[PDB]
Every structure is written in C-alpha cells, then in structure tokens.
Design a protein around this nucleic acid. Structure first.
Ligand SMILES: Nc1nc2c(ncn2[C@@H]2O[C@H](COP(=O)(O)OP(=O)(O)OP(=O)(O)O)[C@@H](O)[C@H]2O)c(=O)[nH]1
Ligand SMILES: [Mg+2]
Ligand SMILES: [Mg+2]
Ligand SMILES: [Mg+2]
Lengths: 250, 404
RNA sequence: UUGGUGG
DNA sequence: CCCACCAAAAA
C-alpha cells in the first residue's frame, strides 16, 4: 500500500520526463500533423519536433542557445542554423532580427504544463530507498542511471555507504511552517507555491514520513534530490522539512 | 571548547536566523533572553523569516515538553579557507577562520569573519580614501582562494591596489596563499583527466573539458556556437577548488559516519577488537580493509568506514587500539545529520557532539599529510609538502567557532 | 546559452 | 575560480 503508492509516484515521474513528454504534445496530441508538414518543407522529423519542443520550453531563445540543444542531429553547426531558418520562414516560430531572438508560436497546453511542473522532478520516496550496491540506480525502484551527477560515471568506489546512510533518514513535512509561508510571506510565484502543496499532500497520502535520495558529484560533495521538497536549496524549502523521529529535548 | 544545553542551541539557532550569526555565543544567547517573550512578532524583520519562525515554534514546543523534529544549523565559517589552513599548517590563516581561537585584548575568544579581517587590514594600509566596497573584496578573496586571477584583477585593477591585495594575503595567510599559487603550476598539459582517491576510498575523476567554438551565419549576420568538448589545456585553474571541495566532501561523509552510526555495528567492532567476537570472515573484505588502513598510515585520517570491512581475519591487519580509540572519540548516542556541504543540521541536543566531531576532523587534517597524499596523485609523482606550524592541530581540537 | 537557487 | 540545481517572452 505504501509500496503501491511509491510505484504510483515513480509512474508519475517516468511519464513526465520533460523532453519526452513535450514531444508527445507535438506528435500524438497535436491537431497539426507535424510529420506531414515537416516532410513537405524537407526538414528531418525528429529535428523539427525537438526544435518545436525547445521553443515551447524557452519561449524566447537567441541563436547560439537554440543550436546547442539540437547540435547532435547534424554533422555541422551550420546545418542546424539553416534548418532553423527554414522552420522560421515556414512559420513554425518567428525570428525577430531587432532583438536577435526566436519567439515561440506553438506552446503546450496549460494542463500538460501543470503536470510537468508537478512531476518532472524526482520526489521523496515514501518507503525506504533501495540499498545501493553498484554505481547504477539512485534509490528508486525504476531508475538505473549512473548515480554520479552529470556525465561522470565511474565504477570505482564512490562511497555508496554514505548515500545509503543519508537515504534512510526519515523526514516529514512541518505543515505548520508550510502554511505560514502561504498565509504570511507576502506581508513578511503564487503559481509556483500552488503546486508545492499538491505535491506535498500527494507525497504524504499514506502518512507524513518520507526519504530523500542522495547523489554525489564527481568531487564527492553530496546532493539531496528533489525540487519541491529538499533541505538543500531555498530558505523557503529548508524551513518546511524536519526529522520524522521527533525527540524530547530536556 | 565551551558546551551548551540543548535548549541553548535552540536559542543560538533562532538568533542566527534573525540574524546575528557573526556575534559571539553569549551575545547571541544574551540577545535571545531579552526577546524570548516577543519572538513571534520579530518574524517580519528577521533575515530568514521562515527558518526563524520554524525555530521559534520548536522553542515553544520544547517549553511545553512536546517532542520536536526541528534541527538547528551550525555552519562552517569559510570552509575552504579552513581546510587550506589545516592542509598547510598555517596558524595565521587559521586565526582568520576559527580553525584556532583568536582572543582580543580583553582575552575573549572572538567569532572571526575572515573577509572582514582582510577587508579591515586592507583599509588600514591603503589609507587615505581607499575606494573599495567590502563585498567586492570578499568576492576577490574567495575566488582567489580557489585560484581566480581574473576576478581580483577586476575588483582591484592591476596596479598598486592589486599589489596591496596580494601583500595582505601574504601576511594574513602565507602558506595558504603559497599553496594556491602552487596549484596553478600543477596542471598536466597532456592529461585528459585527473584522478585521486580520498582516504575514505572515494575516487575523484575530473575530465578536462575545453571550449570548441563553431561559427555560424544566419541572415548574413555572425553567431558563435560554443560547446564543451573533452581535451587538454596548457594551464589549469581548477585543481585548488576541486581538491578543496573533495576534502569538504570527505569531511561530510566522515562526520556523518561518526554521528549517525549503527549502535549494533559499534558493539560488534568493540568485541572484535577485544577478541570476543564469534568467528566471521569474508575474503572480499580483505582488499578494502587493506586499502583503507593504508590510507590511514599515509595520512592520519582513519575512516570509520573501515568498520564495514573488519572481521576475524581482517582485524589482524589493523592496529586494534587505533580502532577502539576512534570509537571512543565518537558520540555516546548516535544522531541524524543533514548537510549542505559545509552547513550542518541536527537536533539541538546533539549540538555539542557535532561541534566536537567537526573539530576532530579539522584537527586530523591539520596533524596529518592529506595534502601530500592528494597532490602526489594529481601531479603523478611523490611530493611532500610540510606543515608551516606542525603543532597547529593541538589548538584545532579546542577551537571555539569552527562551526558557528 | 541569458538569468535565478544553494555551497 | 569550482560545483550542483531551477526558469523560461510581449500588441
Ligand atoms: N569556488 C567557489 N566557491 C564558493 C563560491 N561561493 C561560495 N562558495 C563555497 O562556500 C564556501 C564559503 O561559503 P560562503 O559562500 O562564503 O558563505 P559564508 O562565508 O558563510 O558567507 P555568507 O554569504 O554570509 O553566508 C567556500 O569555501 C566555497 O566552497 C564561489 O563563488 N566560488
Ligand atoms: Mg549562510
Ligand atoms: Mg550562470
Ligand atoms: Mg551564488
């Protein structure tokens, strides 16, 4: 039942990986048939969808920024920028020469954007994270990526013992502090804080107790994983977290 | 090192978040006692409103005898400078950043703020209108300590002001400054990657990534498209930051090992050391036990990680008195610790323990040879750097504000 | 990449 | 100088 809830949370996270979920909005969910149109203007299918996706993310983007995300599709940096001109002239999005940027035309629905805002980032686990025994897997039951942050994998010893020791600290939400910020911070964005509570409530559906997963960078600094709930990161974030195992101080 | 009650650590944490975090311990508690009865009204003018409020609610829950889950925060005062002071045995640098006690003429131990000290030292000698803001000075200090030459050149120019800046650093932290100097000349122009192992077995790999800039034309106007590629480089400015960060990384892992320990594992190791454990042995334990014991011999840093690999056969390869001494130096009751690289949070009834454990680690780094051990792997040959004051570690054990 | 978060 | 992570703009 908490195991079931945990599988549900991971199910939500896996469906809302940013870029694959955005692509769906331009493939199987668009009224527009981008496959046919991209054939028409002679633009590679996967390239065009990715450019549409990058524009729905950035909203506005200068040329070096947009070519960076797409460089891996072509043998040349130049080929990428040409394809982008071809798409801008065919009204896939606009380029305004007076500000030297691209401006989006086709953006994802608000309903899909809210799911991405809620679930694209890892959440705490509501069961004990898996014991780590190799440098793959980050504590969850369905991920087996390199545990080291960014593209820095090794199979040499990276002190799994520390991650395993941090991963089993049980934590909980202090709802008293969490309500204070929403009620009292403005006299001390609004859209952002709206999704925090939905996630925190969903998170704690089977009880106010959960665990943060931990990953090392290449140097061995240790980072707790998650955006909405994290004792690292913002001051408005730290304040809400406490130990699940309370104690009488004396 | 003076101790505090659990309730007093709550007081210090709430004062910090108002915040008076650069004030001495007793001034912070004195400020608290004065305002205890009006705390909920101070939330709107505190530097960290949310953390202040959480602390206040915890204080109230404690007064009524209710259990709490709220952890207080104790932060390293200039982590990086602290580690470099300890690595190099630099007594002058240590006094900048609470690695050892500094007393004023009154003789009170002061909570020092290195950047302010160096900012004041710089106005005192520059004199006669010195046009420099303190935070621009902190940026120059802290980026320089990690090897930046561009950012101090930007805050101080390249003339007499820069000269005064480098002279001040050379009196306030000679060995730290020389070591930062030295790291610059340690890059290998043929290397695609640097590798070194920490004494608790963590393998650090730094791949050398260099800018590749493809230029592009779009509407007959030029755009430069820069992408990071693996390569080599003639100089490198990264070793000081990466080595120092690997060491604070080490301090985090080891501090959490010594604080959040398995009470049943400790009692097994104590019996194992005294010949009273039932026979248990695994051949896979041997390699790692040997490796970690070796790092202890070369460095002075005994990791409690070694407990994971000690068995009836493997205990034979270590000195059992060193293992028992380490265990005896650990907290008598274990506790959870949350860490933000050089910030530490725990329940307030473990405040005393977490400061004792931080102090021991700084002192361990100060006493031993971790710097040589790491530099030798970085540059590819045996080197030895000496301590500038080989007794600094004795004072480190007793320092007051390493965490504040 | 412009920015912003923590250290 | 070194990391790690968000967030996505105006008639
Ligand atoms: N390399 C590098 N490290 C930084 C930088 N900013 C913070 N740090 C890290 O933070 C440590 C010191 O913490 P600070 O950011 O100076 O915090 P502080 O000294 O308590 O000062 P406050 O900002 O008032 O909290 C250094 O040793 C670094 O490891 C930076 O710009 N570059
Ligand atoms: Mg701070
Ligand atoms: Mg930036
Ligand atoms: Mg910053």
């Amino acid at each position: 039942s908490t195991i079931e809830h945990q599988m549900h949370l991971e199910k939500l996270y896996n469906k809302n990986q940013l870029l694959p979920r955005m692509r769906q909005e331009f493939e199987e969910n668009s009224g527009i048939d981008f496959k046919a149109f991209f054939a028409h203007i002679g633009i590679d299918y996967k390239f065009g969808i990715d450019a549409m996706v990058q524009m729905a993310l950035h909203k506005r983007a200068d040329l070096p920024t947009l070519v960076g995300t797409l460089r891996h599709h072509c043998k040349s940096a130049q080929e990428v920028a040409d394809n982008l001109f071809k798409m801008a002239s065919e009204d896939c999005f606009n380029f305004d020469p007076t500000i030297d940027k691209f401006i989006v035309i086709y953006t994802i629905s608000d309903d899909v954007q809210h799911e991405l805002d809620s679930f694209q980032y890892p959440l705490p686990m509501v069961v004990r994270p898996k014991l780590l025994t190799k440098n793959y897997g980050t504590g969850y039951f369905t991920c087996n990526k390199s545990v080291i942050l960014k593209k820095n994998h090794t199979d040499d010893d990276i002190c799994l013992d520390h991650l395993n020791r941090m991963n089993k600290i049980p934590l909980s939400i202090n709802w008293d502090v969490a309500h204070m910020v929403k009620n009292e911070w403005a006299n001390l964005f609004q859209k952002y804080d709206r999704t925090a509570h939905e996630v925190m409530g969903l998170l704690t559906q089977e009880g106010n107790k959960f665990y943060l997963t931990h990953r090392p960078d290449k140097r061995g600094r240790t980072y707790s994983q998650g955006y909405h709930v994290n004792y690292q990161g913002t001051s408005w974030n730290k304040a809400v977290l406490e130990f699940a195992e309370k104690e009488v101080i004396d | 090192m003076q101790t505090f009650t659990a309730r007093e650590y709550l007081k210090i944490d709430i004062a910090n978040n108002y915040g008076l975090d650069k004030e001495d311990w007793d001034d912070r508690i004195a400020w608290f006692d004065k305002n205890e009865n009006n705390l909920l009204n101070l939330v709107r003018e505190a530097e960290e409103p949310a953390l202040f409020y959480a602390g206040v609610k915890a204080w109230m829950d404690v007064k009524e005898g209710k259990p709490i889950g709220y952890p207080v925060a104790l932060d390293a005062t200039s982590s990086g400078l602290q580690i470099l002071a300890c690595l190099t045995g630099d007594r002058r640098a240590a006094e900048l950043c609470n690695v050892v006690n500094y007393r004023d003429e009154s003789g009170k131990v002061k909570r020092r703020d290195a950047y302010t000290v160096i900012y004041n030292k710089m106005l005192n000698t520059l004199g006669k209108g010195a046009r420099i803001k303190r935070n621009d000075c902190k940026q120059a200090i802290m980026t320089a300590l990690y090897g930046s030459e561009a950012k101090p050149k930007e805050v101080f120019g390249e003339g007499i002001m820069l000269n005064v800046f480098e002279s001040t650093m050379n009196v306030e932290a000679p060995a730290v400054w020389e070591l930062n100097k030295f790291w610059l000349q340690c890059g290998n122009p043929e290397a695609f990657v640097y590798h070194w192992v920490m004494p608790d077995g963590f393998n650090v790999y730094i791949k050398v990534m260099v800018n590749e800039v493809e230029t592009v034309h779009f509407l007959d106007k030029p755009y430069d498209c820069v992408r990071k590629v693996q390569g080599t480089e003639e100089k490198t400015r990264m070793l000081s930051a990466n080595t120092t960060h690997s060491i604070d990384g080490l301090v985090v892992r080891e501090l959490v090992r010594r604080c959040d320990y398995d009470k049943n594992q400790i009692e097994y190791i104590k019996a194992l050391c005294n010949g009273e454990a039932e026979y248990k042995a695994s051949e896979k334990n041997y390699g790692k036990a040997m490796e970690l014991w070796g790092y202890y011999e070369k460095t002075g840093f005994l990791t409690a990680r070694i407990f994971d690999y000690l068995d009836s056969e493997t205990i034979k390869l270590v000195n059992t008195q060193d293992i028992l001494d380490l265990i005896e130096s650990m907290p008598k009751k274990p506790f959870h610790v949350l860490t933000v690289h050089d910030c530490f949070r725990c329940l307030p009834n473990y405040g005393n323990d977490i400061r004792r454990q931080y102090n021991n680690l700084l002192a361990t780094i100060a006493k031993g040879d971790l710097l040589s051990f790491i530099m030798s792997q970085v540059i590819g040959q045996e080197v030895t750097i000496g301590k500038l004051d080989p007794t600094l570690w004795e004072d480190v054990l007793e320092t007051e504000y390493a965490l504040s």
